[PDB]
Structure formats: C-alpha cells, structure tokens
Design a binder for this molecule. Sequence first.
Ligand code: HEM
Ligand SMILES: OC(Cn1cncn1)(Cn1cncn1)c1ccc(F)cc1F
Length: 526
Amino acid sequence: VGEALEYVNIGLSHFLALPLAQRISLIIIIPFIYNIVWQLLYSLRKDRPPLVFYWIPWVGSAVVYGMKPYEFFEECQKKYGDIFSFVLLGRVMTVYLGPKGHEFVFNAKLADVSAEAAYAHLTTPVFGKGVIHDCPNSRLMEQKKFVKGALTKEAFKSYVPLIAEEVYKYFRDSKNFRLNERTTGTIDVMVTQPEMTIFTASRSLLGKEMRAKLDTDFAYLYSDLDKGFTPINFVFPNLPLEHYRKRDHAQKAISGTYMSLIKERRKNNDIQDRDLIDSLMKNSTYKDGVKMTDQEIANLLIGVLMGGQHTSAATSAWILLHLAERPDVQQELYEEQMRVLDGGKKELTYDLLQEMPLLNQTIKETLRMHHPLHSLFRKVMKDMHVPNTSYVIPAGYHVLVSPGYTHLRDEYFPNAHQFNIHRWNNDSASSYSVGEEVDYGFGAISKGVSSPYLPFGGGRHRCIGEHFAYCQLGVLMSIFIRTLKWHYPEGKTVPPPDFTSMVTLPTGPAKIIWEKRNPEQKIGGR
Ligand code: HEM
Ligand SMILES: OC(Cn1cncn1)(Cn1cncn1)c1ccc(F)cc1F
C-alpha cells in the first residue's frame, strides 16, 4: 500500500501534465460523474426524503421549477409523496406539500428555521438596510407591530374615500380610460393595475405629499426600484450593471424623499394620524429602548409599499381577467352593489364593504386560484425531524412550503381549476382563526396553520397587510363594477401565470375591453 500511495502522487502529477483540451473536459465531466454517483448513494438513505434526480450539477431542477413549479410539484408528488427534496441553483430544497407541510414550515420553531437568512439578498438590496430581512427576527416582529398600528378599522374608515378618489381620478385622467371622453377602450391590465395600485396605496399609506410626488418624474424612480425586485437577486443581488445602479440610486432617492418629509414633519411638529408615516414617527421604539432611525423608517415604508404593490396589483389584474369571461359574475356583483349602496345613492364606506360578501368572495376565490407567492422558503438552522417519518432535514437545507399548490388540489377544493366565487358562501371572510390563538409580537393570530387555504401564510411571518389588501381591492373592484363592464377580445381567455417573476402575475399582454355602464356619466374635479 506504500507502493499504492506512491502511484497516487504519480497520478496527481500525470494529471497536471494533461493537454488542456482533456482537462477542461476533465474538470467538467468529473463533477458530472460524481454528482450522479452521489445521488445514487443518497437515494439509499432512509433518514432523508427522496431527492429529485437531476443531470446538471449545481443547476439542478432549477429550469423546470422556475417555469412550472406546480406541474413540477405534481409530478414529484405522484412519484415520491408529499415530502421530497430537489437541488436548485446550489441549494437543496425540501418540499412538504399539503396542510401537514403548512404546519411543518409555517409553525416551525424560531431556533429551527430562518426566513431572513433565505430572503436577505432578495429584499435588502431593494428596501435598504436595518429592516424586514436585514435584522434579527424580534426586530421584524416589532416592525410588523409598528405597521399594524396604522392598519386599524378607523384607519380603513378614513382610507376608503381616499382610495375611491384615486380610482375615479385614474378613470378620469389616465390615457388608459379617459371616461369623460371615451365610452369604450382596450387596456393591458398589467399596465393599469400596477399604476392604480401605487396611486391608491401611496395616497392612503404614505399620505398626500408622497401621492403628489407621483405626478412628477419622481414616479420614474419607483419603476427603477421595482426592477430590482427580481428573482435574479437570489443569485446576483449586486452586479456592476446599470440595472443595479438605477435600483440603488432609486432606493437612496426614494428613502431620501421619505426622510425629508419625516424630518420636515418633526421640524414643524406636524405629526397627527394621517398616514403610516405619522404612525411610524410616533410608534417606532423597540422593546429594548432603541428607536428606528429615519433611514430605517423610510426603508420599512419602501418594503411594505413595494411588497403590497406587487401582491395587490397582480391580484386585481387576475380579478379583472377572470371576470372578463364571466359576465354572470359581473352581473351578480353589480346587483350586490345596487342593493348594498341603495342604487348608488349611498356613499361607499368601510362598513358597507363588509356588507358585500360576493365581492369579498371574488377576492377570496382569486387568491385561491392565484396565490401571488407560489413558494415560501426558510433556511434550516438546526436538524429537523419530520414527524411520523424517519426523515431528518439537516441544517444548511432549505424547506419550501406552497399553500398555492394546495389551493389548486381537487381533494381540498372540488373542481379546483374552475373559478367559482360561490364555493365561499357563508365563508366570505379574508381568513379566520377558529381555534386557539398566539402572539409572536404583532398581535394574536391563529395557532394552527393546517388550513388548506393560506393566501396570507401563517406563523410568525404571517401577513399583516391582509385587511388593507381587502380594503384596497374591495374599494377598487366596487368602483370597477359600478362603473364598467368588460370582456375579452375575440378568441382570448384567461392567460397562464408567469411563475418566473417575483409574484405569479399574468402572462402579458393581458388585454380586456371595457365599456361604461353609463356612457353619459362624468367624473368631476380638475
Ligand atoms: C393580496 C395581497 C397579499 C397577499 C396574498 C400577501 C401574502 C403574504 C404571505 C403569504 C406572507 C407570508 C410570507 C412568509 O411566510 O414567508 C406575507 C407576509 C407579509 N406581508 Fe403580505 N400579502 C399581501 C399584501 C400585503 C400588503 C398590502 C402588505 C402591507 C400593507 C403586506 C405586508 C406583509 C408583511 C409586513 C409580511 C411579514 C413578512 C415576514 O414576517 O417575514 N402584504 N404576505
Ligand atoms: O414576502 C415578501 C417578499 N417575498 C417573498 N417571496 C416573494 N417576495 C412579499 N410580500 C408579501 N406580502 C407583500 N409582499 C415581502 C414581505 C414583507 C415585505 F415588507 C415586503 C415583501 F416583499
């Protein structure tokens, strides 16, 4: 064996004297071979979930997961069951499908998994430092608490007429509508809904000043920042191109604008209860006494607005698209509007929104069919034993949960690919905890996360924008319904989702044709 060891050194030597044709080829095919051999040895382990076979090292199943994750999950489920792993751009993802998966991932102990470790590079380059994913979990919990303080019933009461006003103003002024001059038109909903969403959300959450900013070239900065919000950040968060420079500069200029308003308000003591900015100026002190800086407040505002932007705009787009081939549902919704608002003589309020179950069921059904986040990740921090299995998920892995997948399973939602708002009759709430509850720092929420329907997630990372989303989408759809009818161009139908973008927005261009219900109706104001 001493003689064997000599030939090892000889072999190492002879390698380095190989022609580069053969040892680019060498250093290529020997990972390819080792990978296959490694998977074969891996598949024999009884303490690991089955691993989806893949040919290309590092890359893994990235391409099929990236383009059609649900079809990917369905195939893996048929073959392997509800628990399985797959390689994705250098990381091993352990998927757990179904309610048991919801429970395993969303209710995982703080010591076991980390969301911020999974998402920091996705969001921090976009929002700025010190907030959301660029901070400890208990900091995040309180930031969520701070923001929730601006999201009260009384706040929604004041938001509704503000949001309504922005919708009507958009109908009046936008080149996409111009209702005082046009009775019919064609629109790309991936153009109109992001614009309507930023106008309505800015006006209510940021306030008059920041909304006024959107009527200038300052609006261009929001687009630049929006482009940095991309899956590519998972691999290339910072790359010396101008996509990144436009992003970084936008983040600085936008937070600078918020900070200017913040410092301005404090200078003049002008701090009431107008908006989320007022709210955070009065309520952003952590439990240990440390106060958020003006930069961190601005950075939080960016993240919250940006996140709400994408989820809400995608959702109202899908609502329009599903209703476009369903004049029956438009008809039902309109009748509800006529009854609840007394033929339109009653002004829309937050309370009246609560008396519109079909409208809210329509939102609920859209979120079932189109969960804007098709996958949620956590990085595994401590080895996790999978209950009632021999499986152990080692630290360094990632767990993946997908409530959106379950939303589309017939076993939980019969005829899951049919849009049917009536499957939610006497269950028109946005969601509802109906068992024991728990507080992670931002308010009591559902302890159990086993519901097959989880558009807003669960556990410590649960959404806090749920009621704002329903308020915003509710006011907007209420006005769309009362003002317009709409349908598809001949031969067109609901498009497939684009699963490669940050949220599962519709494939473009997604066009609908609108017409005024009352051609002679005029929208007043300047
Ligand atoms: C239809 C609209 C929306 C949907 C479907 C949605 C969905 C979700 C989901 C599934 C999560 C859980 C994330 C995870 O577990 O990793 C989440 C978290 C969160 N969302 Fe939303 N969201 C929506 C709108 C909004 C809005 C409008 C806001 C703010 C006004 C918002 C702010 C947040 C915040 C602060 C978190 C917590 C992040 C964390 O704790 O890690 N969302 N959202
Ligand atoms: O959870 C997100 C980040 N994200 C995860 N997968 C894709 N994007 C999205 N989001 C959820 N509700 C709204 N946006 C988020 C969470 C909080 C936040 F402040 C911004 C933000 F983008």
